Each structure stands twice: as structure tokens, then as C-alpha cells.
Design a protein around this ligand. Sequence first.
Ligand SMILES: CCCCCCCC/C=C\CCCCCCCC(=O)OC[C@H](COP(=O)(O)OCC[N+](C)(C)C)OC(=O)CCCCCCC/C=C\CCCCCCCC
Ligand SMILES: CCCCCCCCCCCCCCCCCCOC[C@@H](O)COP(=O)(O)OCC[N+](C)(C)C
Ligand SMILES: *[C@@H]1O[C@H](CO)[C@@H](O[C@@H]2O[C@H](CO)[C@@H](O)[C@H](O)[C@H]2NC(C)=O)[C@H](O)[C@H]1NC(C)=O
Ligand SMILES: COc1cc(NC(=O)c2ccc(-c3ccc(Cl)cc3)o2)cc(OC)c1
Length: 1100
Amino acid sequence: SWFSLFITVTILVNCVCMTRTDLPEKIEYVFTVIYTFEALIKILARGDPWNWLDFSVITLAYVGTAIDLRGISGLRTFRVLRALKTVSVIPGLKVIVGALIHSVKKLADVTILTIFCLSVFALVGLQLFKGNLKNKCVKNDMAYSSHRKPDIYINKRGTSDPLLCGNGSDSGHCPDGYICLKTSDNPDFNYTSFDSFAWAFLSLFRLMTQDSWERLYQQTLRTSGKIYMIFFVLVIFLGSFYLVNLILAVVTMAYEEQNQATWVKLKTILFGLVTDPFAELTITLCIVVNTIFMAMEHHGMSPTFEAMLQIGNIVFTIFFTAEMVFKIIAFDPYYYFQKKWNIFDCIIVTVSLLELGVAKKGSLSVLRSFRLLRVFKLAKSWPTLNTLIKIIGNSVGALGNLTIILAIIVFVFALVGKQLLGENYRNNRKNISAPHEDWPRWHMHDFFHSFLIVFRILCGEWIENMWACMEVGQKSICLILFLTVMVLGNLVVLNLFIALLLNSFFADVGWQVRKTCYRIVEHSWFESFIIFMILLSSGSLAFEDYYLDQKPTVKALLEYTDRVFTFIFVFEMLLKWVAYGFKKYFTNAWCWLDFLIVNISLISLTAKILEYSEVAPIKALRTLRALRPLRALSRFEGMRVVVDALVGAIPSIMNVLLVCLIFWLIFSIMGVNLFAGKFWRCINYTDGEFSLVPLSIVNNKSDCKIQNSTGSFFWVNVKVNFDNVAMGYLALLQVATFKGWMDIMYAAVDSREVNMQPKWEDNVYMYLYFVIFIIFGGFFTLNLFVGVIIDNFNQQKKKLGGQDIFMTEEQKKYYNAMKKLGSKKPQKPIPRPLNKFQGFVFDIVTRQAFDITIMVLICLNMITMMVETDDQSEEKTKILGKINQFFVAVFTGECVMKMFALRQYYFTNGWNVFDFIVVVLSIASLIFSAILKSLQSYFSPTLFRVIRLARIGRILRLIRAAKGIRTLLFALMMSLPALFNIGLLLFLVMFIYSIFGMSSFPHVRWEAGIDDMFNFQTFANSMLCLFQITTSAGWDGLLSPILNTGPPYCDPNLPNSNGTRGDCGSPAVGIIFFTTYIIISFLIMVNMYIAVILENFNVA
Ligand SMILES: CCCCCCCC/C=C\CCCCCCCC(=O)OC[C@H](COP(=O)(O)OCC[N+](C)(C)C)OC(=O)CCCCCCC/C=C\CCCCCCCC
Ligand SMILES: CCCCCCCCCCCCCCCCCCOC[C@@H](O)COP(=O)(O)OCC[N+](C)(C)C
Ligand SMILES: *[C@@H]1O[C@H](CO)[C@@H](O[C@@H]2O[C@H](CO)[C@@H](O)[C@H](O)[C@H]2NC(C)=O)[C@H](O)[C@H]1NC(C)=O
Ligand SMILES: COc1cc(NC(=O)c2ccc(-c3ccc(Cl)cc3)o2)cc(OC)c1
């Protein structure tokens, strides 16, 4: 076995060699002699595509190793790729890797479709928004070469970016003395644009993955107008929502297919050994009370309060120690230390005694939260927490290999990134650094920050760091590295998620008037009238905006209308009372809701007729009018079905919600132990701009008091902090949703002891807190959540006899009919024309060569539209227009050729009539541009842009060729009807929350997420923000201004205002508004995914 020893030591030293990742170059050359030593032996002894590569690696390493006058650090890459030998060494990873390539082989159809949609939407965005991202708010001149004194801009408040502008009515206006001019450079670093097919394709690829897409949304709306939100509604839905669902499906059957194929002491000991059950109940109560005590500490604790916590902690620790000692003297330590749980209990308690021994205030705070680990002891009676434990265990058990390969991928990518881009970050660190700072917060100088960049990429935030690296280094390596990490890591993480999901979870006179009233209430016209009344009453709410006071007549109009509606609904309730009868009416679960709404309306009306309309309880019931639209769900059956589906799934959601609250309680208690009271800073607030005061001045809260000479210093705190367990839940929500977590991370790593100014990255290893939090509390908790939703949905489906929920019976028959549509293969080829002349065109067009050459011509035209760019030339546009005329002539010729041969059967097939619409639309666009160009009325140039959108139909003609694309879009159009009902529910919720925001949040300071275009002063502005946060994008930015409660941010003393007497939004209402909305929207989107994915299986 000496040969075995030889091979098992050389691979070990080789793997250890690259684990040397640190910067110092103290000992690297000695390893070359071992390389040469092991190289010689293998060939002389003379006793796979990868193995051939392996032979080559030793030769190329020897070539690299001979004379090293110049090093570009490339030589390191060949040895970092040597590490992948260990992948083949362990038996497990081989089959898992083979399965991974297998999923990629089946991703081919989705990839083609995704690229096609991205190209189509990139072309649309290029046509519509070319050069829009070049406008800026430019100072005008007092008084003349082509270039005056350079164009001085204005910064958007709270940022260093120049202000964006537009000449449109709903685009965005500069302040007094500024004009909207098209500048020469683009917003971010001149990389975010629609000025070319490449830039637009990058922007649409960013949109598809929703990585900071809110910035693009706001910029293009600020530069083009609010009406262009229809673009993002289409892109987010079609691009993001669908193609990810296609990926999620394809990974499912690909993976699912793989596993489917496969003396005195004795009497005392005996008494101790026998234990009453009522002995463990006390254990449970002490555990619960101990966690309740630990969840009660905060920042401003009184000395008696901390004393209470200390005495409680000592009482509990000794009690568990007593339980331990009794239990060891009950059994024998041989049999006692066999059980899987008792050893856990022992290690936990002993750590607590060790801490009692070494008790310093701040000594191992993380280990202080080690006694939180006994909360999992309540798993023998809580089945769901037990399933969570089994999930976490399967993550390193039956599915250890996937975690191992994920770790290898992260390690290799981080190390290669360091070796390649490391120096470039440090030397050119000055352009990627913050205005007042000296380093970027995310770089690759050392291994740890490189790993952080890779982890953040895996979390879905890759494009900003890509901009930074492209600014600091060489663009090519940046593209390759960031895109490869994104795709490969996301693939591996998604595969791991699905793998965990599958195996774990799935292993007289009054009587006659009563009768007539019953006739009235069930008459169809009455129902239609009532529905119309609900629609009008709901729509009238969308007019009580910020400017309603400035409009005097419509205010009284809405007054009289709401009075007549509330009288109408009182009358309607009386008819239902007199017809249906009291007992049934109060046992309906819908009439109860309508009755409550009309109660609120009536109380508000009487209290307003009376002079009690400003007392707060009535003023708070006036805000509850936003619930009026909740009367529609009982009317339209689709929303009724969707609501029933949600209610049927609510109970299990409650259980898993409790489990996640417990787990996040553990993490939040740890966070309070680590961070509480440490996020306070001092800022130089002058006018909408603050700057972290340098440590050369204060370093203290006391000094911030003395150096308050200019009256601009403020000892403020981070708005979402870790001072309580409740605030800790908000912080964990922001971190797990990946929105707003940046500021939390920054304040955490900058933290120090209490009452001193934060210092740059003084706690760089507190990043590990958030890494662990994501890995466990986000990943596995979402795993458990999704698993229970899937199981519950399966239960609902079987309960109704295996049918499809979310669909009305009319939509059901539509479903069966359109399914029958998709499977009718034969068509009885049309007759052959008798006339020789009529015949000639028939047998020339019917042959496949004509179709093929027309497809090639369509691809050529797509290429000709790909080369369009902003600010190209006069000549380029002239030639491109001539070629466009050539193509439109060719396609009108093909249309007239087919139409004359196929006389009546031409329109029978849908693709030919669709082609007819495309060609007639192209002719119409051409002639319309010709007439409406400067020869006649000169409307805005933006009209030309939308007219020239008619050529995209020629590109969409290619869908007829791709069979896989034609089947996936078939799956879409079959899944559409259920998505209609779910979207109706989502729109209803969005409307209700829009009304709530338009009443609750319209007087706030313009800040991070709220400005003159995205605020709650108007129904359109509210709907923009609510659509933006439907995907949770940037909800931190809108919540931030509402959390404000005074100076220096808000002004609580504003005479002009009638609400809070200032800006000073309401934090309590603010939290409930946004936090609830994201969960409901998330809960809805899961059902939408489930609706989409099941249709995919039936297609397959
Ligand atoms: C928040 C959200 C707000 C609202 C957002 C808007 C939602 C828009 C939603 C959807 C729009 C597109 C959905 C319809 C797509 C229709 C494609 C289509 O219906 O074709 C497929 C059929 C298949 O037939 P098969 O024989 O292959 O059977 C397939 C064999 N099996 C049974 C195995 C599958 O073909 C046929 O029925 C031939 C007859 C039809 C001929 C004209 C139909 C095509 C016209 C336009 C399609 C363009 C779609 C563009 C999508 C976006 C691209 C960027
Ligand atoms: C299978 C069964 C499992 C079910 C488990 C359910 C059991 C739930 C039991 C919950 C128990 C609740 C315990 C709560 C403890 C009481 C809550 C603890 O109260 C302590 C505070 O009120 C003391 O406040 P101070 O008055 O000291 O305030 C400061 C003092 N100065 C500074 C003003 C002078
Ligand atoms: C520095 O001085 C300014 C003004 O002298 C202080 O600003 C006051 O802040 C308090 C609340 O902390 C408000 O009630 C006052 O209305 C503010 N005054 C003015 C004029 O704006 C600020 O608090 C001081 N900062 C520190 C750290 O001492
Ligand atoms: C039905 O509502 C929709 C959802 C989406 N989905 C997304 O884009 C997305 C990504 C991540 C999250 C997301 C993550 C966490 C929480 Cl708590 C909430 C949401 O949503 C898309 C839609 O198209 C209109 C509609």
C-alpha cells in the first residue's frame, strides 16, 4: 500500500497548497520541488477526458514554473483549477455532477425562449427609450461657442447622482432656473442605457432577474413619463415571473426523474431512574419562561431590570444543571451518553456553567445566545419543528454532496476573483469609493470580501458590484466572472432547494311581502345594479387625494354621492333582512362583512352630521372606508374561488408562521445581544444631505455635544435597528427580503461599544452573523414554508376530487375546449388549383424552401434592426430606412402571393391571418409616418417611436418555427385564466392599500424612496409605488421616510400641514402597512407559481 500512501499524500499536499489563500508570499516556491518530484514517478511506473486535462496540467505547470521574470498572476489559475481533483476523489460528487450537466441539457428549450424574449423586449426598449437616460437638469446661462462653461447640474436630494429630467407632461420637471437638456453621458457609470442592442439587452437581463430593477424603473419613468410603466408591468410579468417558473419547472422534472429511476446509592439511583411525566412538563415551562425572559432585554434597561434578568438566568441555569445531575445519577453515563438529545443538553448546560465562571460584560455574546439552543428541545411534541430539524439534517446528510459542491463553487470563484481582480481594486480604489470614504465596501483585495461578493451575488445582487469592478479593472474578466458565478451558483442553489423539498416532505301579509322581497333580491337586474353601485362607490375613493381640498365642487359632489350610496346599501341590507331572514343572514360569512362595512359608513355619517368628526376614534374609523371595495369579492365568482383557496390553506400557514417566529426569535435575541444600542451616530445635516462625521472630531456622544458649534450636529440612530426584539424582527425581515439590509450590515460592521462613533469596518466578522442568518433562517425556513404550502395544496386538490382550483366552471369549459384545440394534428391539405397560372404560385409557395428562405429573411431583418443605435448619423438612418422599405416590400409581396394562390383557405389557419395583421400594420405604420412627418402636423417625436413598434411583429413571426417555444407559450395561454382571477385579487388588494396609503401616508418628507413622482399624493403615484413593492423591490425606501419622528429629518412643527402637524410619518402604521402587504403579495405569488407549474406538468 506504499503506492497508495504515495498517491494519497500528494493529493493532500496539493489540496493544502491552494488553501493557502492569504496575501503574504513568505513560503510559495518550495512546493515546486514536490511538484517535480511527484511528476516524474507516475510515468516510469507504467502499471478519461478529465484525466487527459489532468496530465496536461502538470506539463503546463512545469512550463509556468521554469523562469518567472514577469508574473501576471495567471499562473495561479491553473493550480486553482487543480483543486477539482478532490471533486472526483470523493465518490459522491461524480453522480451529482453528472445529474447537474443533465439538468443543463434539458434547460436548452427554456434558454432559447428566454433569449428570444430578452431580445424582443430589448428591441422594444431600444426603440422606445433610446437616449432617454441622457437627459439631465442643466442650469441655464446668464448671457457663445458650442461648449459654454461646463454644464453644471443639480444633485438629486439624498444622493450624488445628477437629477434626471424630461420635457413630457408626466415625465419630471427641473426647479426654477434649470432646463431639460440631453447630455452626453449615462446615469450610473455610463453603463445603464437603452442606446444600443447590447446595453438594452443588459438592462432587460437585469430586469428579468429583478436585481435592483427599481432604479431602472424610476429612471426611465422620470425620463420618459409615467405612462411607460406598462412596459415594466409586461416585462416583470412575462420576463421575470414566467421564465423563472419555466426554470423552476424544468429543474423539477429533471431532478425528480433521477431518483424515480433509482447498598445506599442503588435505592437512590432507582428512585431517580423512575421519572414522572409531570417532570418534563416543568422542563418545558422553565424553558419557555427562560426564553420569554431573554426576549425582554433592551437598550434602555433599568438596573433593577438587568438584575431581574441576571437572577432569572442563574435560577434557570442551576435548574437545568440539577436536571442533568439527577438524570446522570438516574441512568448510567454509559447509557445516558448514548441518546442523541442528552449529549446536546449536556453540552448546552456546561457552556452555561463555563460562562458563569467567566462572566465579563461582552465576553462571547454569541455564546451567551447558546442557551437559546434548548428551544429545539420542544420538538418531541411539536412535529413541524421536528420536520425543520430533519430538513437541516438532510442538508448535510442524504444531500451532503450538493452542499459540498456548492461550497467548492463558492470557494473557487472567490479565490479566482481575488487572484485576478485583487490588485486592481486596491490601486484604482479611488473611483469606486464613496464620496467621503476611502475604500469600497465590497471588493476583492482579500479572500473574505471576495467571498462576501460571491455570497451577495448568490443572494441576487450582482450588477452594482459588476459596475464597480468594470470601473476598477478589465471589463472582459468582470463580465465572465460575474455572469458565470450568477448562473452557476443560482443553478446549484435552486437544485439544492428542490432536492431538499422533494425527499424531505414527500418521503299573511308579512309573509307575502317577504315572498315578493325574495323575488326582488334574487332578480338579475337587482344584482347587476348592486354590483354597479359597488364599482362606483369604490371608484369614488380614488378621488380623495392631496388636491381634493383645492377642488371645491367635486368635494361636495363626492359628499352627496357617498351619502346616496350609503343610503342605498342600508336599503339593500334591509331587503336582505326582510327576504333571507335573520338567522341565515348572520350565518353567511359574507353578509357579515357587508353589514360591518355599512356599519362603519353609518357611524361615520351620523358622527359627521353630529359635530364629533374630529375626535380620534371617529377620525380613525373614517380611514376604514378603504375597506369598501371588499364588497366585490362576494359578487365575482373568480375572486370568491381564490379567497376560498386562500382560506383553506390559512391553518397550516399559521403553524409554519409560528415556527418561523420562534426561529427568528432566537436569531433576533442573538442580534439584540450583539448589536443593541450600538447603531447611533453623528451626522452633519445641512440641507437634505448628511455626512458621517469623521472620527478625527468626535468619536463620542459627548464630543458631538461640544462640537455642535454650527448647530448642525445630531446624535441619530439607524432607522431599522436592533434595540428590541420587535425591532429585531423588522431588521431580520429586511435582511431576509434582501431590501434595506445594506444599511444594517454597514452599521453592524462599523459598530463599537456603546456611545462612540462607528469606525470603518471595525467588526468585519459580524458579516458572518448575517451570512448564518440567511443560510438558516431564510433558506431552510422558505424551504419549510414552500413544502407545507405544496402539501396543503395537494390536500385541497385531492379533497375536491383532483380538480383544478382557481378556475370558474365557465373558465373550466374554456380550459377543456382550448386543450382540445392544441391536439388536433391532421388538416386535410387543401385542393390543388386547376388553372395552370393559379397553379404556378401554389406549387411554388407550398414547398418548404419558400418558408425557409422567408425565415432567413426575417432573421436578416431582425439583424438590421439590431444595429440601430442612438446618435448614429444621418446616412445610417437613411440607409436603414431604405432597407426597411425593401423588407416591407418583400413581405407585402409574399402576402399578395399567398393570398392569390390560397383564395379562401388562407385565413382558415391562424398563422396566416396573424401574418396579414403584421403586414397591414407595417404598411399602415409606413404610410402614417410618411403623412405625419414634418410635411403635416408636428406632434411630439415620441409618437414616431411608438408608431415604429409595428415591425416587432415580423420578429414575432418566428414563433411558428420553434416547437419548444410554441409549446411553452401554449402552457402560458392555458394557464392564463387562473392567473386572471389571481391578478384580479391582487389588483383589489393593491387598490385597497392604495387608498389606505393615499389617506395614511401623503404628508411625508421627500426622501430615499419618496419623491415628487413616487409618493402617496395621487392615485397614480400610489399605484406606481405599490406595483414597485409588489415584488418587494425597494419597500425599505418607502418605509424609511415614514419611520421619521422629528428633527433633523422631519419638522414636527409645520403650520401649512393638517395631519401630523409636520412631515413625521407614523412609524406604527407604517410598519403594519408595508410589512403586511409584502407577505400577502408573497402569499399570492406562491399560488400563482403553483398555478403556472401544474399546467406545465399537464403539458409535459
Ligand atoms: C401583471 C400582468 C398584466 C397582464 C400581462 C399580459 C399577459 C399576456 C399573457 C400572454 C400573452 C401571450 C400568451 C399567448 C401565447 C400564444 C402562443 C400560441 O398560441 O402558440 C401555441 C400554439 C400551439 O400549437 P401546437 O400545435 O404547437 O400545440 C402545442 C402542443 N402541445 C399540446 C404539446 C403544447 O400555436 C397555435 O395554437 C397556432 C394558432 C395561433 C396562431 C396565432 C397565435 C400566435 C400569435 C401571437 C403569439 C405571440 C406571443 C408572444 C409572447 C411574448 C414573446 C416575447
Ligand atoms: C405544552 C404547553 C406549552 C405552553 C406554554 C405556554 C405558557 C405561557 C406562560 C407565560 C408566562 C408569562 C411570564 C411573564 C413574566 C412576567 C413579566 C415580567 O415582569 C417584570 C416587569 O413587569 C418588571 O418591571 P419593573 O416594574 O421592574 O419596571 C422597571 C422598574 N422601575 C425601573 C420602573 C423601578
Ligand atoms: C445640536 O444643536 C441643535 C440646535 O442647537 C439641536 O437641534 C435640536 O434638536 C432637538 C431634539 O434633539 C429639537 O427639539 C430642537 O428643535 C433642535 N433645535 C434646532 C434649532 O433645530 C441638536 O439636537 C443638537 N445635537 C446634539 C447632538 O447636541
Ligand atoms: C403575485 O405577485 C407577483 C409576484 C411577482 N414576483 C416577483 O417578481 C418576486 C420576486 C421576489 C418576490 C418576493 C419575495 C419575497 C416576498 Cl415577501 C414577496 C415577494 O416577488 C411577480 C408578479 O408579476 C406582476 C406578481
